Design a protein around this ligand. Structure first.
Ligand SMILES: Nc1c(Cc2ccc(-c3cccc(C(=O)O)c3)o2)c(=O)nc2n1N[C@@H](C1CCCCC1)S2
Length: 1718
């Protein structure tokens, strides 16, 4: 559409607050003019009290709601206005606009609104619900902010409510917000907060916003209120969460438009009370001065003031407002010296001089200043240059009616409520630093000042006098008489406001901006007064929505923003692109011109002089000039300030410069204009310097980062770097510090001196101890670095940060912030940086910060790591990091070239039954599959395929499997994936593709060993995870089906570089070894992500170079488009929230019509992010835009879902996937996503391996997750990210994939490295060595230290050690170094294994398995775990003790601690049978203990705790069985039996002492107390009273029936062979026999136990008195078994024994037979 560049200087209201659209001004009632020839006097009488309306009453506090009476104490009766508003405010949620006269007591109105909100959260149980809500009170003045905080604090204190001011800071704001229910603050402050884009972390709980002095709209600051409200309203649209707006305004024209602006219903929430509703009727007098001359005008003024004080003698109190703090005393002195006169009126004011209050004001002469002179006369002064004691004194003496005449500053009017009867305002002229001139006093100030006239309980009438220049009388008449119209200044600030809305992402283009302007006060005002705003009535008539004017305004502003490089704007499409300068400009609230200035002048080599100059050139200061009259003082100041102000003479630039230096130096000033200018530059200075800091930090300029950060800290602490750091402690006597400075010696030394030596050094021996204290209060960090080379271009750094200093809540508060800076050898460039927060609770703990730095092969000597405080001056530490001794890894070879072969057809596979698996899906294989097709399908040799996830590597493995099936139809193939999820997917796919169609056997290995051996027996294709195949193939010497396998396929072998990688490496190695120790070679096919060193993997696995295919990530068949989006927010919650809008924009930009997966860190974020995508969609007025079916069509599917929110989001086209959903529900959401019915799915990270789903676009929402064990957020494994990115692939539908990674900025570089380029992997087996060595020693593959050294040579470790020595901590790549290092490895491993009694070492060479080592190898348990068992187990060990011991296993170390899990585990700790002693709830072993007890009690838990419980239960059995073996091996009966009982009761999920009938499904608790029992005697199988005593389910009859046909049936015979022929010391043989009725079909049935187990039994012989286990055997039943138990007989042959038969599965099946021997 046509755009016109406007002249904005034409359309703006120049006069700002002083602008009057007003034409005439009509004076109320009778009114009159008196011409005194020095001036004219206009009188306006009080207005009469309009009679009451029908059903209207002043409303005593007793009548307003119960809970609300508190806070209103001290008030017996609500004010008239307040009474009319009390129903609207308290009983409705409607938005209100209240226009009231000055003085109307709006505080109580706002308070009623607040009390309405608070009243929802009453929480009748306790006091209040504090964390459910937040209230925001916006006030225009800092003084008023402080006042309101005090007031609301006192009045609401009864409700247990925190009310607080918001003081400008990065972090302290964040957590002081969280603790605060009522935040009081200024418009631009809340603007700065809600600009940050992660704004919702502050605003999400805000239910109420009160705008005080909303007529500020008319002021030059008004556009801030416009931005605030526009933003809030639109956000209410987008979150669908309601927020109430309350405006409070003066009585002025246009108020109905202000009502429209705030969206208040005129018939509901609009209340306008004219001046007559004022609670104290006000008489007005307007003086104005005829002509221009000098002192005569001021003399006239003083005369007016005196004449008017005189008319109130001992009668009333007079408050007089002056515009300077020195003028308070000047005028108050002038007036009482004018009171001497002819015959003195000097004290007519207290003629109550019979000493009354007269000696109260004269007893108060213990005071200071000008007060001491004035007070005994009843005169006083009030300003901000006084002190809280003197100001409180003046206020108190004026409130007690002691002080009669009080002269003061506006600060009093805003800051405290103290009305006088009479108010005189002198001159209405005030200095404005930002306008740089003297100007007419702000309208808000006049209103607030005259609002102090008359005292609500003390006065029948109030009075006020406004002394002004004669011209300008009509303005103040207009203002106070309700004729000065409220207009919109938005045109003035439009470009900055537009930029802020672009940065937030609320405006993506010109059209969005037009719609945005539609929310502004400007839109309404332009509609209703087009001519005033420069619009033709013709235009308006043809364009009622002002499309043209809005588009023009926006075009103009966008050209301005584009010019100054805050935004990229093309005039054709009208799209906007945020820039970094724009983002900083918005965030730090700096004007766009300033940003262009900084961007021009800022450079890496900028000096400090030039830095001060650049700051001085900020456009915030553009109206400042140097006056002649202040020149001299500037000169003096220039002399005492340290930084040269270069030869710029006094132009404004140098004036600003010197004023800032002087502020830093704390020089005192005289000139009032010079002082005002100083306060103005310096209050802005912190923000501006912080902006320059962020610019240069993010550009990587080290020197200027240091300078600017320093300047920030200097401006905040008001001291130069030159001075003593101890100045930053305010409690330190300043001459002690000056003493320290004058000594001239490094501050650093002070650290190492004792207090005696310190006091000695400073010549102040008395002070040495305190100074020592403060030296050690000063924040200090110690730094440790650990270098691991990754590639020739990349090093990994672990920075260990150790706090060395004493924390003080008074000094350091809740946290301390630092910057980690990684700089080059010349300290000119910041190579890496990140924010680091040291929290108070986590102090004294070490912190580990991991990051990656670039290096360049002509390697420097060193880099530098500086850790620098964000706040404190001269608080820093530097760590050199030396590259001298570094060995860069070996250059990795080029990737395999992708040759363009013809896209080979499915027919090249020559078997048609094979081709029927493919031809339906596709005609041709992709380039990766064609290039490799010959080698894998046609050859027999080992092959490596590297390629980006989604290159279709799986059917390469399928090629190999088909060839195997051609070679031998009975052949055996084993397949390995690191992930169980991957295994199950591959299982479903390959079961269909092989077992169904090709009719071979396809099996998936399970937890249990025997059934897995059985499956390995049956299997043509065997799917497994590494540990399952590990426990299987350890015994390969004795297992031939392990030996004979035709094909070994290992998938995702790059996972060797990850956690659990060592087991993968070990089993692959073992397979290579087996292959070379036997006749018929086992083939190896390895599939991987693109690896930088593929050769090492290939060689390791036996692949020739021709059989090695390693493809670069950019040859991925469906080309990927990757975008990495950085967010500089260290706080994860805030970062996540700030990602919400980028997620949506990513969807609508990169994949508007096509399917989209969004991955999020956690369960709750799935739901949240889905709901956001929902509401945001709806708020583009495009809803169901992601629903590509009819809502009706889904219903039959949605009825199958349990989750309400999921039903709702699915109705809108957005599904989600988290661990809390059932497998069915998950499959359902997947099916719906795949069919294209829903366009968007949001999945938690834990499901990324378990999703069979593809998208056009994958969005990764953050990269980090909480680790509660280290109390920190940690990064995603690169493998998870690679899989996730791999999910955007659709070869049939799409011509490309698209992926957007949104991560913390400090992480961006990392992802640019290991995503675009191929991934290096290393081995971690050298930290895992013990269990594997132990295993191979138990099978006697390692018989000695040489055997160990040779075992290592089959590993990937062996290859990588000479490739990247420094990574493994080798000091050379030589064979000498390799042999040495491997020898130390072998040595320490074998030694540790011996100390744990796992192995035996003879002659320092030979090794042998001991008992524990064999246990650990058999049950697959870590050596430290069985070592621990053997140490903690004894003859006295019981059930409780056994649970406590097994929970302490090493397997359970890896149980995670999630965010705020300590609370939930504390509550769970209170709900369990066994209390834990002083438990730490971030302890995974405590957690597993509690979850074990939880599982026994059948307590249901959160989804995460449930999955954790699953993982625990999996290995619980093997741990228990190990305890049994250890316990019996020591010959202890009772604890072993206890262990068996624990095994049963862990399997069936029931406790030790309880009804045995709980095993039967659906039976619970109080169901029946029926008989008062045993499932064996309950089943004499009857038919019986199942009707009579039960609660009768139809389904559970079938399930219980299914249980009893499974549930163990057993009877036992035994003979001890050759009874009495056995005599002492000789063999005793007890033969036991198991034969059964109702033979076995199916596994053990244990619904609550996750894995599918086998029945197993212990036949035990023991003496039940001496607690001696005399013999033991373990077996399985099936049909029949023979059981022989042999043991040695004692002397004196009368001896009595016991025979126990116990299960591992069920309870109640235990049997005992007593007997006798010899
Ligand atoms: N001009 C006054 C202002 C202006 C003003 C413009 C931009 C801002 C501002 C900008 C950024 C952040 C904040 C923040 O709150 O963090 C604030 O703050 C103010 O905020 N508070 C007061 N102001 N005047 C005083 C009274 C003192 C006796 C004489 C009459 C005025 S109280």
């Amino acid at each position: 559409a046509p755009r016109q560049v406007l002249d904005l200087e034409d359309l703006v209201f120049t006069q700002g607050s002083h602008f009057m659209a007003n034409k005439r001004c009509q004076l109320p009632d009778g009114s009159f003019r008196r011409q005194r020839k020095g001036y004219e006097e206009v009188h306006v009488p009080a207005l009469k009290p309009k009679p009451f309306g029908s059903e209207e009453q002043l409303l005593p506090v007793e009548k307003l709601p119960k809970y609300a009476q508190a806070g209103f104490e001290g008030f017996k009766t609500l004010n008239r206005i307040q009474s009319k508003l009390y129903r609207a405010a308290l009983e409705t949620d409607e938005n209100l606009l209240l226009c009231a006269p000055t003085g109307a007591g709006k505080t109580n109105v706002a308070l009623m609104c607040m009390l309405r909100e608070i009243g929802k959260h009453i929480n009748m149980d306790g006091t209040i619900n504090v964390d459910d809500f937040k209230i925001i009170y916006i006030a225009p003045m800092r003084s008023l902010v402080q006042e309101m905080v005090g007031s609301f604090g006192k009045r609401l204190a009864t409700y247990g409510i925190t009310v607080a001011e918001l003081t400008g800071d990065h972090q302290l704001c964040k957590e002081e917000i969280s603790a605060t229910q009522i935040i009081v603050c200024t418009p631009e402050k809340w603007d700065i907060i809600t600009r940050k884009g992660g704004e919702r972390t502050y605003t999400q709980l805000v239910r109420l916003i009160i705008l005080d002095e909303i007529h500020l709209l008319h002021d030059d600051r008004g556009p801030v209120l416009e931005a605030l409200v526009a933003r809030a309203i639109r956000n209410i649209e987008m979150t669908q969460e309601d927020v109430r707006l309350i405006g409070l305004s003066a009585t002025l024209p246009n108020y109905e438009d202000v009502a429209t602006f705030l969206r208040v219903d005129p018939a509901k929430g609009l209340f306008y009370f004219d001046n007559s509703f004022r609670p104290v009727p006000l008489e007005q007098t307007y003086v104005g001065i005829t002509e221009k001359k000098a002192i005569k005008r001021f003399q006239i003024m003083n005369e007016i003031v005196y004449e008017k004080i005189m008319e109130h003698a001992g009668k009333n109190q007079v408050l007089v407002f002056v515009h300077s703090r020195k003028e308070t005393g000047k005028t108050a002195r002038a007036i009482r010296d004018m009171c001497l006169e002819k015959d003195t009126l000097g004290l007519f004011l207290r003629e109550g001089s019979a000493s009354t209050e007269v000696l109260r004001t004269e007893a108060e002469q213990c005071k200071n200043l000008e007060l001491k002179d004035l007070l005994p006369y009843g005169f006083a002064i009030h300003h901000a240059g006084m002190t809280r004691v003197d100001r409180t004194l003046v206020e108190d003496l004026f409130a007690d009616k002691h002080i009669q005449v009080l002269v003061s500053t506006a600060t009093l009017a805003w800051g405290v409520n103290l009305p006088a009867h009479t108010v005189i305002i002198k001159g209405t002229q005030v200095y404005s630093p930002e306008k740089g001139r003297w100007t007419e006093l702000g309208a808000l100030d006049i209103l607030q000042m005259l609002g102090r006239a008359g005292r609500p309980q003390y006065d029948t009438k109030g009075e006020g006098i406004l002394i002004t220049s004669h011209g300008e009388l009509q303005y103040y008449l207009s203002l106070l008489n309700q004729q000065l119209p409220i207009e919109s200044q938005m045109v003035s600030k439009l470009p900055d406001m537009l930029n802020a809305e672009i940065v937030l992402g609320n405006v993506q283009n010109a059209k969005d901006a037009v719609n945005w302007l539609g929310y502004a006060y400007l839109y309404i005002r332009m509609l209703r007064s087009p001519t005033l705003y420069g619009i033709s009535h013709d235009d308006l008539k043809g364009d009622p929505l002002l499309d043209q004017r809005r588009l023009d305004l926006v075009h103009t502003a966008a050209l301005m923003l584009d010019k100054n490089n805050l935004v990229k704007y093309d005039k054709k499409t009208g799209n906007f692109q945020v820039t970094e300068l724009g983002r900083i400009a918005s965030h730090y609230y700096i004007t766009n011109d300033t940003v262009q200035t900084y961007n021009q002048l800022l450079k890496p080599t900028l000096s400090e002089i030039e830095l001060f100059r650049v700051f001085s050139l900020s456009s915030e200061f553009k109206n400042i000039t140097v006056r002649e009259e202040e020149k001299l003082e500037l000169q003096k100041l220039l002399e005492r300030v340290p930084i040269p102000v270069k030869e710029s003479i006094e132009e404004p630039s140098a004036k600003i410069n010197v004023l800032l230096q002087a502020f830093i130096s704390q020089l005192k000033l005289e000139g009032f204009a010079l002082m005002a200018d100083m306060v103005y530059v310096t209050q802005s200075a912190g923000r501006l310097m912080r902006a320059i800091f962020e610019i240069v930090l993010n550009r990587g300029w080290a020197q200027l980062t240091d300078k600017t950060l320093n300047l920030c800290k200097m401006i905040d602490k008001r001291m130069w770097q030159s001075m003593c750091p101890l100045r930053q402690f305010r409690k330190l006597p300043e001459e002690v510090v000056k003493k320290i400075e004058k000594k001239n010696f490094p501050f650093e030394r002070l650290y190492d001196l004792n207090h005696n030596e310190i006091g000695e050094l400073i010549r102040m021996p008395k002070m040495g101890k305190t100074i020592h204290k403060y030296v050690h209060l000063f924040p200090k960090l110690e730094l440790s670095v650990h270098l691991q080379p990754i590639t020739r271009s990349t090093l990994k750094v672990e920075l260990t940060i150790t706090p060395d200093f004493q924390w003080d809540e008074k000094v350091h508060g809740s946290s301390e912030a630092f910057w980690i800076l990684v700089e080059d050898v010349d300290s000119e460039v910041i190579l890496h940086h990140e924010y680091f927060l040291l929290k108070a609770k986590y102090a004294q703990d070490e912190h580990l910060i991991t990051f990656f730095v670039p290096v360049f092969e002509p390697l420097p000597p060193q880099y530098f790591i500086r850790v620098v405080s964000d706040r404190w001056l001269s608080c820093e530490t530097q760590l050199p990091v030396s590259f001298r001794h570094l060995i860069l890894p070996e250059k990795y070879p080029p990737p395999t070239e992708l040759l363009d072969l013809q896209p080979l057809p499915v027919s090249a596979l020559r078997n048609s039954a094979f081709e029927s698996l493919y031809q339906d899906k596709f005609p041709f294989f992709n380039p990766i599959q064609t290039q490799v097709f010959n080698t894998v399908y046609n050859s027999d040799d080992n092959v490596f395929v590297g390629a980006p996830t989604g290159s279709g590597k799986t059917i390469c493995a399928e090629f190999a499997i088909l060839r195997m099936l051609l070679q031998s139809s009975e052949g055996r193939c084993v397949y390995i994936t690191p992930m169980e999820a991957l295994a199950e997917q591959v299982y479903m796919d390959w079961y269909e593709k092989f077992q169904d169609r090709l009719n071979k056997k396809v099996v998936l290995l399970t937890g249990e060993t025997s059934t897995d051996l059985k499956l390995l027996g049956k299997g043509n294709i065997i799917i497994s995870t590494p540990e399952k195949w590990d426990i299987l193939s350890r015994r390969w010497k004795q297992r031939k089906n392990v030996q004979n396998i035709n094909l070994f396929v290992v998938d995702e072998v790059h996972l060797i570089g990850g956690e659990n990688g060592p087991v993968l490496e070990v089993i692959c190695s073992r397979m290579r070894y087996i292959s070379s120790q036997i006749e018929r070679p086992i083939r190896i096919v390895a599939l991987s992500s693109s690896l930088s060193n593929a050769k090492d993997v290939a060689h390791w696995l036996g692949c020739s170079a021709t059989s090695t295919f390693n493809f670069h990530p950019n040859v991925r068949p469906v080309p990927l488009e990757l975008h990495i989006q950085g967010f500089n927010i260290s706080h994860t919650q805030t970062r996540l929230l700030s990602m919400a809008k980028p997620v949506y924009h990513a969807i609508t930009k990169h994949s508007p019509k096509k399917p989209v997966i969004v991955f999020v860190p956690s369960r709750k974020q799935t739901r949240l992010t889905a709901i956001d995508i929902l509401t945001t969609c709806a708020a583009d007025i495009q809803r169901q835009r992601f629903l590509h079916c009819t809502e009706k069509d889904l219903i039959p599917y949605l009825e199958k879902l349990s989750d309400s929110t999921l039903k709702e989001t699915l109705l809108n086209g957005v599904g989600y996937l988290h661990e809390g959903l059932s497998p069915m529900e998950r499959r359902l959401v997947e099916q719906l996503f795949s069919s294209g019915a829903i366009q968007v799915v949001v999945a938690s990270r834990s499901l990324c391996w378990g999703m069979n789903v593809a998208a056009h676009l994958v969005i990764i929402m953050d990269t980090q997750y909480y680790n509660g064990k280290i109390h920190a957020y940690v990064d995603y494994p690169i493998y998870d990210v690679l899989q996730m990115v791999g999910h955007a692939n659709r070869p049939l539908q799409d011509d490309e994939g698209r992926c957007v990674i949104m991560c913390q900025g400090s992480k961006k570089d990392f992802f640019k490295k290991f995503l675009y380029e191929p991934l290096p992997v290393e081995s971690h087996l050298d930290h895992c060595m013990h269990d594997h060595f132990n295993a191979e020693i138990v099978t006697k593959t390692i018989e000695n230290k040489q055997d160990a050294v040779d075992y290592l040579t089959w590993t990937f470790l062996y290859r990588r050690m000479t490739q990247n020595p420094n990574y493994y901590n080798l000091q050379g790549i030589s064979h000498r170094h390799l042999s040495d290092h491997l020898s130390e490895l072998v040595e320490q491993t074998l030694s540790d294994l011996e100390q744990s009694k796992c192995i035996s070492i003879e002659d320092e060479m030979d090794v042998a398995p001991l008992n524990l080592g064999m246990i650990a190898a058999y049950y697959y348990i870590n050596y430290t775990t069985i070592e621990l068992f053997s140490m903690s187990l004894n003859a006295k060990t019981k059930v409780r003790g056994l649970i406590e011991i097994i929970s302490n296993a090493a397997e359970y170390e890896n149980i995670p601690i999630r965010h705020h899990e300590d609370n939930l585990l504390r509550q769970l700790a209170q709900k369990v049978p066994h209390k834990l002693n002083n438990p730490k709830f971030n302890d995974p072993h405590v957690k597993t203990n509690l979850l074990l007890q939880a599982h026994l009690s059948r307590m249901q838990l959160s989804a995460e705790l449930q999955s954790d419980t699953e993982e625990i239960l999996s290995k619980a059995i093997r741990l228990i069985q190990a305890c049994v073996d250890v316990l019996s091996s020591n010959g202890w009966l009772s604890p072993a039996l206890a262990a068996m009982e624990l095994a049963q009761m862990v399997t069936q999920a029931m406790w030790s002492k309880d009804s045995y009938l709980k095993q039967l499904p659906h039976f619970t608790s109080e169901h029946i107390k029926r008989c008062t029992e045993s499932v064996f005697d309950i089943m004499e199988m009857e038919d019986e009273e199942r009707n009579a005593l039960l609660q009768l389910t139809d389904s559970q009859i079938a399930d219980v029936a299914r249980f009893c046909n499974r549930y163990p049936n057993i009877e036992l015979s035994y003979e001890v062979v050759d009874k009495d022929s056995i005599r002492s010391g000789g063999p005793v043989v007890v033969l036991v026999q198991l034969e059964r009725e109702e033979e076995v079909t199916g596994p053990v049935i244990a619904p609550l136990f996750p894995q599918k187990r086998e029945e197993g039994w212990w036949v035990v012989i023991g003496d039940a008195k001496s607690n001696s286990l005399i013999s033991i055997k373990r077996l399985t039943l099936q049909q029949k078994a023979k059981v022989k138990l042999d043991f040695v007989a004692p002397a004196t042959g009368a001896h009595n024994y016991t025979l126990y038969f116990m299960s591992d599965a069920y309870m109640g099946c235990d049997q005992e037979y007593k007997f006798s021997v010899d």
